[PDB]
Amino acid sequence: KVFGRCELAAAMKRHGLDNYRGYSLGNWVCAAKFESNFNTQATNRNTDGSTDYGILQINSRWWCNDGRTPGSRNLCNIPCSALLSSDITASVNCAKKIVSDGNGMNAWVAWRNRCKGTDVQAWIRGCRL
């Protein structure tokens, strides 16, 4: 599923991401825009052999099991395919664990390079929240 901008903002708010670990809703929408273009089915292989999955490009090196990332962890206790569903629950719940691990949203390279320090509130402008 490719979400609309305001549709995803609303879904993320329902699932408790607005101000989660202090990160306003616009940060999460911005991160999803640049990680996946709001496409739940996005997958991208990393140089180390791991793969990033879903709207927030969650990495199999640490967070989910894809059966093909030797020596990796599965800290969200989910198959990586669960991060590709039209229902964003699994991605949101795993993202909550990631953002709580110490480095905040810096875990997401696209957030660090394209959202951090910007007027992220623009990503939710006009949306009925």
Question: How distant is the alpha carbon of residue 21 from its chain centre?
Answer: 14
Q: How many CA atoms lie within 13 A of 27 on its CB side?
A: 21
In this complex, which beta carbon is closest to Na ion, that of residue 65 or of residue 85? 65
Residue 52 bears catalytic tag? yes
Across the chain, where does the E strand assignment appear? Answer: 43-45, 51-53, 58-59
- Using CB under 5 A as the binding rule, the residues of this chain from 4 to 63 that contact Cl ion are 5
**Residue of minimal Cβ distance to Ru ion:** 4
Torsion-angle region of 20 (φ positive above 0: left; ψ -120 to 50: alpha; else: beta): beta
Residue 35 bears catalytic tag? yes
Find the catalytic residue in 7, 18, 35, 119: 35
66 is in an annotated binding site: no
Token pair listed for 45? 């292989």
- Using CB under 5 A as the binding rule, the residues of this chain from 43 to 72 that contact Na ion are 60, 65, 69, 72
Residue 75 contact partner, candidates Cl ion, Ru ion, Na ion, none, CB within 5 to 8 A by sort of partner: none
Count CB atoms within 10 A of the CB of residue 96: 15
Strand partners, 67: none
Give the residue ranges of the annotated binding site for substrate: 101
Positions touching Na ion (CB under 5 A) are 13, 16, 18, 60, 65, 69, 72, 74, 129
Q: What is the set of active-site residues? A: 35, 52
